[PDB]
Amino acid sequence: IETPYLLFLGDAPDMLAAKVAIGIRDWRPDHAVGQISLPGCGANLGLTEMTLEEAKAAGAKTLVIGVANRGGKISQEWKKVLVQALEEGFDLASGLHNLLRDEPDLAAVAEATGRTLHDVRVPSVQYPIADGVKRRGKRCLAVGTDCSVGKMYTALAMDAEMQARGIKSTFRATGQTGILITGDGVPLDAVIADFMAGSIEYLTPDNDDDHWDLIEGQGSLFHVSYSGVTMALVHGGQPDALILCHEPTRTHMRGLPDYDVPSLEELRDVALPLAQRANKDCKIVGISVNTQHLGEEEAVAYLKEVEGRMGLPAVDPYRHGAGRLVDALAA
């Protein structure tokens, strides 16, 4: 995706629909020159409100859909702006369920203007079958006890810290949100079975010996709907370092009311031998817990006993940053 962006907010009624736009603004502010809102928009993202022509003059290359749709249909009100952006010289990028290229007007305008539609939720390049060959560079993967346990935030927090420290690193997106944030990645949840692991090898190629890939995790080895997606990361990713991610108050898996959440111990016992198959030197180096549903001192107490029991640094990166996780990568 050509950077920098104009962030499309559409008619999103508030900030709830604007997770992607917020993610770009917060994590890669240099990738956004401004926002464009339709009448009735209530998402006060806080960037410079620009017309298409103003955003073009400011250097924007891609109109990025930063708000949710519904999973339904791209409205004609939206396409009216999208078409005009194409005619104004913008590429489009969208992580929605409905694909821009399945809109015959968007596809034909894109073809006539020479502009590109980036439907980042589904693959647009052919990935190979993984070869398991050892790749130069270092690779860190977060694995968790459930979906939505902070894997993406943890990888983003570690990368941001490492960048501030002058450590060579790249956040390697594996889903549409992270791809729109960084402008590149692999939409692993939409990759065909046989190419899953190969797509993660493609995502994390040979790099400098002192370079870190911070791979965005997906699924869970303990989630019967997605465990194979996680497996492809664990092996395709060849991780040198695992971060264990966990949220402690939930009593069931995501969307699976009758499935337990495993402990950090069984996550450790199951994940490490699998990871060691692809990289025999892989180590679990730290634990990143979402403690937002605990009280302040409850969180501090929980983290302390986790650290003493697992013998690994355990932090909540939102409460205090990723610095102790980044320190753990140095060994």
Side-chain angles (χ1 to χ4, degrees), residues 148 247-250 289-296 299 316 318-319:
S148 320
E247 193 285 313
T249 76
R250 68 184 62 179
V289 180
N290 174 9
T291 64
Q292 74 166 109
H293 296 293
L294 308 174
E296 248 279 355
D316 184 330
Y318 179 79
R319 288 188 187 270

Side-chain angles (χ1 to χ4, degrees), residues 8 117 164 169 178 194 199 201 205 248 265 287 291 317:
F8 177 82
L117 307 172
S169 65
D194 276 5
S199 73
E201 297 194 338
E265 270 100 341
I287 301 176
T291 64

Side-chain angles (χ1 to χ4, degrees), residues 5-9 21 25 32-37 41 43-52 54-55:
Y5 305 154
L6 171 66
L7 295 190
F8 177 82
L9 303 183
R25 170 199 80 187
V33 312
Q35 67 190 47
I36 177 163
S37 312
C41 177
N44 275 260
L45 178 81
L47 300 189
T48 301
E49 181 72 28
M50 301 180 164
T51 68
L52 290 172
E54 278 159 12

Side-chain angles (χ1 to χ4, degrees), residues 81-98:
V81 178
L82 303 181
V83 165
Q84 191 197 341
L86 287 168
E87 295 284 347
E88 211 60 47
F90 292 76
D91 291 330
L92 307 179
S94 156
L96 305 177
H97 169 79
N98 273 253

Side-chain angles (χ1 to χ4, degrees):
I1 311 173
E2 300 301 318
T3 55
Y5 305 154
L6 171 66
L7 295 190
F8 177 82
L9 303 183
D11 58 343
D14 47 45
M15 294 301 274
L16 288 172
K19 285 275 222 172
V20 164
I22 293 158
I24 297 167
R25 170 199 80 187
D26 288 353
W27 288 113
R28 300 288 187 276
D30 292 350
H31 285 176
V33 312
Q35 67 190 47
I36 177 163
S37 312
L38 281 178
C41 177
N44 275 260
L45 178 81
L47 300 189
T48 301
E49 181 72 28
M50 301 180 164
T51 68
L52 290 172
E53 183 170 41
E54 278 159 12
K56 193 67 184 97
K61 294 300 141 165
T62 302
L63 181 163
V64 174
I65 294 190
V67 291
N69 192 33
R70 55 217 179 79
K73 117 215 239 279
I74 304 145
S75 78
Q76 171 51 40
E77 291 77 2
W78 282 28
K79 292 204 282 186
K80 179 180 193 303
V81 178
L82 303 181
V83 165
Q84 191 197 341
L86 287 168
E87 295 284 347
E88 211 60 47
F90 292 76
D91 291 330
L92 307 179
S94 156
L96 305 177
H97 169 79
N98 273 253
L99 305 184
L100 297 184
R101 75 162 137 86
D102 292 331
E103 303 297 325
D105 47 330
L106 301 186
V109 173
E111 175 72 35
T113 58
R115 306 272 50 104
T116 298
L117 307 172
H118 290 288
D119 285 304
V120 306
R121 195 186 55 83
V122 297
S124 63
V125 313
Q126 274 293 335
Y127 305 111
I129 297 171
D131 61 29
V133 174
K134 182 213 289 223
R135 300 194 295 289
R136 278 163 326 212
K138 300 177 290 192
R139 293 174 183 77
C140 171
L141 175 68
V143 296
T145 51
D146 192 15
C147 303
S148 320
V149 297
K151 296 189 234 69
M152 193 187 76
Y153 179 90
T154 295
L156 280 166
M158 292 173 69
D159 171 73
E161 172 76 30
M162 295 158 73
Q163 284 297 297
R165 287 184 186 193
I167 292 160
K168 295 160 146 190
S169 65
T170 311
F171 169 88
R172 295 299 196 173
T174 54
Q176 58 100 5
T177 306
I179 292 160
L180 295 172
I181 287 167
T182 66
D184 216 333
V186 162
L188 181 55
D189 288 286
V191 169
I192 293 164
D194 276 5
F195 310 109
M196 291 191 300
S199 73
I200 297 318
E201 297 194 338
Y202 169 98
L203 174 64
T204 58
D206 281 324
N207 217 312
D208 295 355
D209 288 354
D210 55 339
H211 171 277
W212 275 104
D213 290 311
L214 293 181
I215 312 181
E216 171 186 6
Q218 300 291 347
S220 169
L221 289 170
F222 298 90
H223 196 300
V224 300
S225 312
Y226 307 111
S227 55
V229 188
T230 308
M231 186 65 105
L233 283 157
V234 167
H235 280 167
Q238 262 181 22
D240 304 274
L242 296 176
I243 308 285
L244 308 192
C245 293
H246 183 62
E247 193 285 313
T249 76
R250 68 184 62 179
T251 43
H252 65 85
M253 308 283 292
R254 286 313 84 172
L256 305 180
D258 298 331
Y259 277 85
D260 276 4
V261 186
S263 64
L264 294 158
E265 270 100 341
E266 39 193 324
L267 178 56
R268 172 192 66 200
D269 298 336
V270 170
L272 180 64
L274 294 171
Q276 284 173 336
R277 173 66 163 162
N279 181 341
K280 54 161 166 53
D281 294 327
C282 176
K283 280 155 174 50
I284 299 154
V285 307
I287 301 176
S288 174
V289 180
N290 174 9
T291 64
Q292 74 166 109
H293 296 293
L294 308 174
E296 248 279 355
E297 299 196 339
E298 211 161 42
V300 169
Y302 175 81
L303 289 179
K304 170 163 169 169
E305 82 90 15
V306 170
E307 176 151 355
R309 174 166 46 94
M310 313 277 304
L312 298 158
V315 303
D316 184 330
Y318 179 79
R319 288 188 187 270
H320 295 286
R324 298 192 61 215
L325 306 174
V326 173
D327 295 340
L329 291 192

